Amino acid sequence: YNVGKAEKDGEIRLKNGVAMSKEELTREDKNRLRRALKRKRSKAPDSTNIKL
């Protein structure tokens, strides 16, 4: 057995074995995690209107 992706759509589980519910994640943590993923992915006419 090896830890994989989230079964629930609202969770992030990393290969470290830590699962992350999006609800409890703070906004700043969510931002970096989104950026963290991105790095992983990256290398992988009318006269009146015209006048006025």
């Binding site: 589980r13 074995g17 830590v18 519910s21 409890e24």
Partner: protein, 233 residues
Amino acid sequence: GHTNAVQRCSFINKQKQLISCGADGLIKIWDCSSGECLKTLDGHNNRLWALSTMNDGDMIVSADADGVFQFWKDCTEQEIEEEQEKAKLQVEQEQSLQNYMSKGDWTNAFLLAMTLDHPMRLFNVLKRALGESRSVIFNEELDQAISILNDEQLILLMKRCRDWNTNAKTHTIAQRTIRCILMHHNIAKLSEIPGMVKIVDAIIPYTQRHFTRVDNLVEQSYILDYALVEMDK
């Protein structure tokens, strides 16, 4: 959007909506302003020739060619009230949870983060609560709380402990939680729950790896005997 011929058409909710009957036996509720099917009711298996409405469509009566009547009752406000209460109860749970962590009421906090299904908090509940235990397995209150968990409640936890067990930096928290469950529950009931065995499959090898390790560390401790006996000389 109807598969077959539309036989009846009646307005409900003033000018806002329309209801139609089709030979397919499906009742489709549409929005007149947008012309989109908001809801589909399927209580019949044959063509529908009659449709009676009352109180702007609050009561809808549809008769089947087979001879079946469906008395549909509007309940939109009923459900909307339910979701509002669920959201309201939902909101109360986080705020109750967060304060519990700040106050240090871990035994109850275990219940809240579990119900909200919050891994970091849950992992944080057990981790620092265990630290207080260092200062039966965790404490009398939390241990009892673990006992009362139901089968699905138990399904969630060993999923987490399995994942935690894989990482050597976090296995120790997982092991004690597994220890608490085995000693505060009937193992016969555990084996009966579906999914335990497959989750239990993954826990054996990693636990053995941890057992093989640590045992080796105690070996490396015995360097110290050589220091004492030698430095005693």
